Design a binder for this molecule. Structure first.
Ligand SMILES: [Zn+2]
Ligand SMILES: [Zn+2]
Ligand SMILES: [Zn+2]
Ligand SMILES: [Zn+2]
Lengths: 105, 105, 105, 105
């Protein structure tokens, strides 16, 4: 089990799970830069709520978008972790698309 | 106390509570497959936020649906844990029904 | 510091804080029934998300209502912990009032 | 790593991060008053959900506003931690502005 500590919030996943998408922060060597030997875990000073959506992506290969979250904050987390371009699931695509436009008016 | 670790988020309930609904993942032997002897807890690489609704069901025998959550992601968690068919409480039935239709258009 | 473990989610407050409102579950002797000597903490198999609003009440003497939460589930937690009648802050009163009516139609 | 325990919820950040904005509770000596030597961490009996937005501010110098949260409860947390005046990001400014007005009608 890999421990991904995001601003105090403990997340845990498998190395194999993350390796599913090389070519992202967590699935590549970029992750090494955030490791803390002393604690045997990776630390990220990022938003712990939005991170749930980042991690979930590794299992489904799909992204869900939380309506209640700010679209800018959401996109920033995707950009940071390398989920680019964003592959939003059909279930969430329209709302994400609509919010992006509204935010850009 | 049974520890249900969902992607790093610790949940705890009673064995008796889960046994209330046999014929679901958590209330049956299916759960054994997710146990980790080394840590004395069960691990699930599933969504930790939506899991609250799964667990709550065992106490009430009823399900609540979070409006802010994606209906597809919600249903996927129900399908995974065996809460099938979903028994949504009257308080949440209509919104769940409406969202399911909208998502299927 | 008093540890209030709600379905795996750790909450911590002061005994003095809870004693502010006698005549509620947490501020009275009713709480003793949920104590676990072995762990030096109280356990509640209740909703860990809604509990934030219960605890917050002790500091302000006022209650906030989360729009995204199901009003029935919300009221059930208030009923369980003895926050009766509910003293919803003016900031949240109307929405709570509106949702209660809608849920009762 | 600095541990900021908010009502039982563990948050962690860097001293350098907090020092970015002197002239706030967390970035100044005001923080000392909340330290607990016995546990080597700071304790705050405040809302653990809204705190995510407080902490995030230190990294971006910008604030996001959660639509689902009560605007009064939100502003109270900003006032308490000294994020005054609030510097809401453009992405969230309008909604925050609108909600403030609605709450003041
Ligand atoms: Zn979705
Ligand atoms: Zn409901
Ligand atoms: Zn309020
Ligand atoms: Zn924003």
């Amino acid at each position: 089990l890999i421990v991904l500590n995001v601003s105090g919030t403990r997340f845990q996943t498998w190395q194999d799970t993350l390796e599913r998408y090389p070519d992202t922060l967590l699935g590549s060597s970029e992750r090494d830069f955030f490791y803390h030997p002393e604690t045997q875990q990776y630390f990220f000073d990022r938003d712990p709520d939005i991170f749930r959506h980042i991690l979930n992506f590794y299992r489904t290969g799909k992204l869900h978008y939380p309506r209640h979250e700010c679209i800018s904050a959401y996109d920033e987390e995707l950009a940071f972790f390398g989920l680019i371009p964003e592959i939003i699931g059909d279930c969430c695509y329209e709302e994400y698309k609509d919010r992006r436009r509204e935010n850009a008016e």
